[PDB]
Structures are given as structure tokens and as C-alpha cells.
Amino acid sequence: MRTRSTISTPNGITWYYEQEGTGPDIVLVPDGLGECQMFDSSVSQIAAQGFRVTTFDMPGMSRSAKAPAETYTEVTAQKLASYVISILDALDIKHATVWGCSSGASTVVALLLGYPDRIRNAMCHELPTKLLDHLSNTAVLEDEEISNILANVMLNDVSGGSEAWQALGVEVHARLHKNYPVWARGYPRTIPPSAPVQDVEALRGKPLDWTVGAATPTESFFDNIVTATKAGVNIGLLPGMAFPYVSHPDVFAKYVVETTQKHLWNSS
Amino acid sequence: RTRSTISTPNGITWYYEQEGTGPDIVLVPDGLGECQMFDSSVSQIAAQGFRVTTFDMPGMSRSAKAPAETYTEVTAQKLASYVISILDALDIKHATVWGCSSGASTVVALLLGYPDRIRNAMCHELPTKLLDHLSNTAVLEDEEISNILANVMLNDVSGGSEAWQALGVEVHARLHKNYPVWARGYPRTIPPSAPVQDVEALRGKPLDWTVGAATPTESFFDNIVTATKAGVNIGLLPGMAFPYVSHPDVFAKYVVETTQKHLWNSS
Numbered sequence: 428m429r430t431r432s433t434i435s436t437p438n439g440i441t442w443y444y445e446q447e448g449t450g451p452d453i454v455l456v457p458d459g460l461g462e463c464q465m466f467d468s469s470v471s472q473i474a475a476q477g478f479r480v481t482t483f484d485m486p487g488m489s490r491s492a493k494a495p496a497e498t499y500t501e502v503t504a505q506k507l508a509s510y511v512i513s514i515l516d517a518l519d520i521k522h523a524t525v526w527g528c529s530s531g532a533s534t535v536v537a538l539l540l541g542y543p544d545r546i547r548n549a550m551c552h553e554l555p556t557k558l559l560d561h562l563s564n565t566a567v568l569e570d571e572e573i574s575n576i577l578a579n580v581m582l583n584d585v586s587g588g589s590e591a592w593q594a595l596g597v598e599v600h601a602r603l604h605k606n607y608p609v610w611a612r613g614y615p616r617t618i619p620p621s622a623p624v625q626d627v628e629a630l631r632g633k634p635l636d637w638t639v640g641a642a643t644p645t646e647s648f649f650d651n652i653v654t655a656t657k658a659g660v661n662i663g664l665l666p667g668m669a670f671p672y673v674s675h676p677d678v679f680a681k682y683v684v685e686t687t688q689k690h691l692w693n694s695s
Numbered sequence: 696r697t698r699s700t701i702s703t704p705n706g707i708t709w710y711y712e713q714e715g716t717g718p719d720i721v722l723v724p725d726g727l728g729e730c731q732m733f734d735s736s737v738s739q740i741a742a743q744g745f746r747v748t749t750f751d752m753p754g755m756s757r758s759a760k761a762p763a764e765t766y767t768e769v770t771a772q773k774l775a776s777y778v779i780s781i782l783d784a785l786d787i788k789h790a791t792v793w794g795c796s797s798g799a800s801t802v803v804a805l806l807l808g809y810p811d812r813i814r815n816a817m818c819h820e821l822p823t824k825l826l827d828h829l830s831n832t833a834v835l836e837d838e839e840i841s842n843i844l845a846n847v848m849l850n851d852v853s854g855g856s857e858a859w860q861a862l863g864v865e866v867h868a869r870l871h872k873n874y875p876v877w878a879r880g881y882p883r884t885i886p887p888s889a890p891v892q893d894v895e896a897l898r899g900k901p902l903d904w905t906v907g908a909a910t911p912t913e914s915f916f917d918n919i920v921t922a923t924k925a926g927v928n929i930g931l932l933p934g935m936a937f938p939y940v941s942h943p944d945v946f947a948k949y950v951v952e953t954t955q956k957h958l959w960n961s962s
């Protein structure tokens with residue numbers, strides 16, 4: 428039942444993408460690691476509730492690595508938003524519900540403010556608004572040190588379930604190995620200052636549902652909870668940390684289905 | 696530093712410590728009721744021109760001589776009246792107050808209930824939700840409550856296992872006796888008594904709110920939402936529930952700078 432293919436956009440990207448189901452469109456935008464295999468279990472469960480679910484590897488990452496250096500260096504929310512609009516255009520998806528975590532969160536808030544005709548509703552999780560010294564310092568190391576550093580962060584620190592992280596399998600971890608240096612050089616220095624949450628009055632009234640990981644240290648996304656509350660945006664918790672779609676895929680799929688159904692009710 | 700006892704008309708015999716001269720700062724303990732956790736910070740705060748007072752809480756540690764009403768069905772409003780009682784006995788008429796956990800509930804009830812006595816309040820990690828796993832501990836035997844909660848404090852909420860163990864055997868022996876008292880008196884009655892149900896009563900008050908930097912987001916998520924809705928200053932301290940144990944110099948600086956900010960805004 429699942430389409431696994433490639434499609435080329437006039438910005439020079441050859442995207443790897445996957446697609447399952449029929450009904451209203453839901454688009455799962457990956458985190459900075461740009462790896463859409465992490466959504467595998469959830470794509471099926473969500474599509475089974477009467478939706479067409481699309482996801483993709485992000486430009487320069489995993490199977491979407493045939494792309495111009497412009498698409499994976501000095502990356503901003505506003506760039507990533509324009510690239511997602513290009514693949515939606517190429518797949519004839521006119522109106523979409525969107526999910527994003529981390530740099531994906533910045534992207535989906537950028538899609539909702541920048542292309543409101545295209546976005547039914549956005550789900551953002553743990554939107555990075557602060558430069559982090561220790562992530563930025565990795566950008567200057569050698570490829571194999573970055574990979575060994577960030578691989579152990581993901582496994583031991585921020586996976587929110589190391590068993591489920593490992594069970595992604597050898598083939599996934601070999602793609603992630605290659606993505607770590609690309610991400611370290613292109614993302615942590617430029618993503619946070621691009622965060623589209625400078626203007627709280629721009630967020631008020633929009634179809635946005637904001638989450639943070641229940642197990643994440645409070646300091647990491649404290650700023651997200653303050654901004655959502657000041658803007659009157661629905662803000663809540665998912666289990667786990669930065670990868671609820673890996674650590675708790677059934678709770679993640681249920682959240683995406685119920686949030687989308689609530690906005691289909693309020694459309695009508 | 697004065698280390699002494701004092702009796703109040705409500706039948707509590709308080710153990711208390713007091714150091715320095717200048718405007719009054721009162722350090723209210725967390726639910727475990729042990730004021731030795733403030734020992735280093737009391738000196739640093741007092742050296743900056745303050746009179747610093749702390750005390751063991753009713754029925755805990757060296758304030759154990761007290762009526763059973765003082766450590767059963769405990770609410771913020773009850774603890775607020777007992778703090779006022781020892782403040783009256785020490786002739787402290789205007790004070791800055793710190794409190795963590797059930798202490799945080801106490802200092803917000805102090806600020807609302809007795810506005811003429813309280814210059815400003817610092818509240819840390821105010822418990823607003825019943826926790827079934829904590830409520831259920833109270834119906835076990837003493838020695839299994841102590842073994843269990845001694846382990847929770849160290850591994851889950853200390854925010855610094857080495858500084859927690861460095862408190863020493865004398866302190867850990869008092870905590871050992873306190874756990875059953877705390878288990879039976881606090882976790883089932885403190886959260887429903889949280890004085891944060893009315894957001895509008897908080898707006899414009901001299902209240903400074905913190906949460907622990909390393910605490911899981913789910914624990915005090917509700918505090919950040921409430922503070923933000925009421926326009927109350929909300930920020931972080933390093934560690935978890937015991938910043939005065941895990942990061943005592945950062946704790947002292949926070950208490951001094953907050954109090955100095957409110958002395959300026961007074962005049």
C-alpha cells in the first residue's frame with residue numbers, strides 16, 4: 428500500500444518521499460537529521476484512519492542527498508518552508524495538515540505564517556529558539572568525530588527511549604552516520620535565530636498545536652511554553668523527548684489523528 | 696549565628712537559626728522541614744547586609760515538639776499561619792520569604808494572606824497536582840517509607856547526588872524520622888491547597904517564581920503556564936527541587952539580587 432519513490436523540484440532537489448492512504452493530506456516533516464524512516468510505523472496507523480500521509484528525507488540528508496549545497500548550508504526555517512512548498516507543489520498537495528519536530532517545528536510554523544492558504548493546521552514540537560555553544564562548536568570538527576559525538580548524544584541523552592532508538596536498525600544508523608556532519612555544519616548556527624516566534628501577535632488565533640517532551644529537562648523548551656501561553660496557543664506534552672515518533676509511535680500517531688480530526692471539525 | 700528554640704501560643708516549640716543585621720530574609724524549608732540544608736547560603740546572604748532567619752518545620756527534625764494538628768492534613772494556609780506565629784515571636788514585622796515545594800505554597804499563601812508582613816516572595820516548584828505514587832506511600836510502615844523516600848530524594852529530585860550525600864549522617868538521620876511524618880501529613884492535602892487557582896489575585900504582586908533547570912518538563916509545566924498567565928516573573932535555577940543544596944552560591948546570589956530588586960522598587 429505504500430508508495431516509495433523520488434521526485435525532482437525546479438530548485439535542484441531530488442527528494443526521496445513515501446506516501447500511503449487516501450483522504451485529507453497530512454505531511455510529516457522530519458527533524459534536522461532529515462530521516463523519514465523514523466515515521467515508518469506511524470505513517471501506517473495514521474493512513475488507516477482515512478488520510479493520505481506524505482513524508483520525505485530532507486534536502487542533503489539520507490536518500491534526498493542529491494541537492495545543491497545551498498539547501499543544506501546556512502539553513503533557516505524560511506528556506507526549509509520554501510523547500511517543503513516545492514515538493515507539495517510537485518506532488519499536487521494543495522491543502523495540508525503538517526507535523527514538525529525541532530528544525531521541522533521551525534519549518535511548520537514558517538509554512539503556517541508564510542503560506543496560510545496551503546496549511547489546514549500545524550503541529551510543532553520543541554522549536555529551537557536558543558543558540559547552543561556545544562552544538563555550534565561541533566561544526567568545526569572532522570566528519571568522524573562529529574558522527575561519534577552526535578550518535579552518542581542521540582542514543583544516551585535525547586532519544587527518550589534508547590531501546591526504540593537502537594531498534595531503528597543498522598541501515599537507518601548508517602544513513603544517520605553520514606547526516607550528522609551535514610546537520611552540524613548547516614543547522615545549529617542558523618536555525619535558532621530564524622525561529623518565526625519573534626512576533627507573538629502573529630501567532631494569536633492561528634491553527635497551531637504546540638508540544639514539548641514530558642521527559643526533556645525544563646530549561647530546554649521553557650521559552651516555548653512562555654511564548655505559546657502569551658500567544659494563547661494550545662500547548663501540551665507528548666511522552667519522551669525529541670523523537671516521540673520513535674519512542675512512543677502509537678501515542679504520536681493518535682495525537683496526529685485526533686489533532687487533525689479536531690481541525691476538520693472546526694473547518695466545517 | 697544564633698541557634699536556639701522558641702515557643703508560640705499554638706503549642707509549637709520551634710528550632711530556629713538567625714544571622715546578620717539589616718532587612719529581614721526568611722528561608723522556609725521544603726516539606727522535609729530541615730533548615731540545615733540552608734547552612735552555607737545563610738552565611739553568604741547575611742554577609743550582604745541582611746538578617747537571615749530559618750527554622751525546622753512543625754513536627755520535623757528539631758521542631759518535633761508540636762500538636763499533631765501542625766503536621767497532619769497540612770495545607771499552605773496552615774503552614775502560613777505557623778510561619779506568621781514564629782515571625783511574631785521573633786518580632787520580625789516585615790520580611791522577604793523564600794520557599795520551595797510545600798514551602799513555595801506557604802510563601803504564596805503568606806504574600807496573599809498577610810500583605811503588610813511580606814516585602815516579596817520567592818516560590819520554587821509549587822506543587823499543584825496530586826501524585827498517586829506519593830499519596831500511596833503514606834499507608835506503608837515507617838522503615839519502608841524512610842528507605843523508599845531517602846532513595847527518591849537522592850536519585851530523582853536532589854539535582855546533585857554528591858552535595859545531597861555531603862549533608863552528612865546527622866542530617867540524613869533527622870530526614871529518616873521526617874519521611875513518615877511528611878508522607879502521612881503532606882502529599883494528600885498540600886496540592887489541593889495551592890493558592891494559584893485564582894490567576895487574577897497573583898497579577899501585580901511582589902512574587903518571583905522559579906523552576907529547576909534539570910527537572911523533567913512535565914513536573915512544573917503548570918507553574919510556567921500559571922506564572923505567564925498572571926504576568927508574574929518566572930525563571931530557572933540550576934538543578935531540581937533543592938537548589939540551596941545542589942548550587943548554594945547560585946542560590947545565595949539569587950536570594951540577594953531578588954531582595955535588592957524589591958528594596959529598590961519599595962522607594
Ligand SMILES: C[C@H]1CCC[C@@H](O)CCC/C=C/c2cc(O)cc(O)c2C(=O)O1
Nearest residue numbers: 458459460529530555585614615618669
Ligand atoms: C535533529 C534534532 C536533534 C534532537 C536532539 C536535541 O535534543 C538537541 C538539542 C535541541 C536542539 C535541536 C536543534 C537545534 C538547532 O539549532 C537546529 C536543529 O535542527 C535542531 C534539531 O533539529 O535537532
Ligand SMILES: C[C@H]1CCC[C@@H](O)CCC/C=C/c2cc(O)cc(O)c2C(=O)O1
Nearest residue numbers: 725726727796797822852881882885936
Ligand atoms: C519534599 C519536597 C521535595 C520532594 C521531591 C519532589 O520534587 C517530589 C515531586 C514534587 C512534589 C513534592 C511535594 C508534593 C506534595 O504533594 C507535597 C509536598 O510537601 C511536596 C514537597 O514538599 O516535596
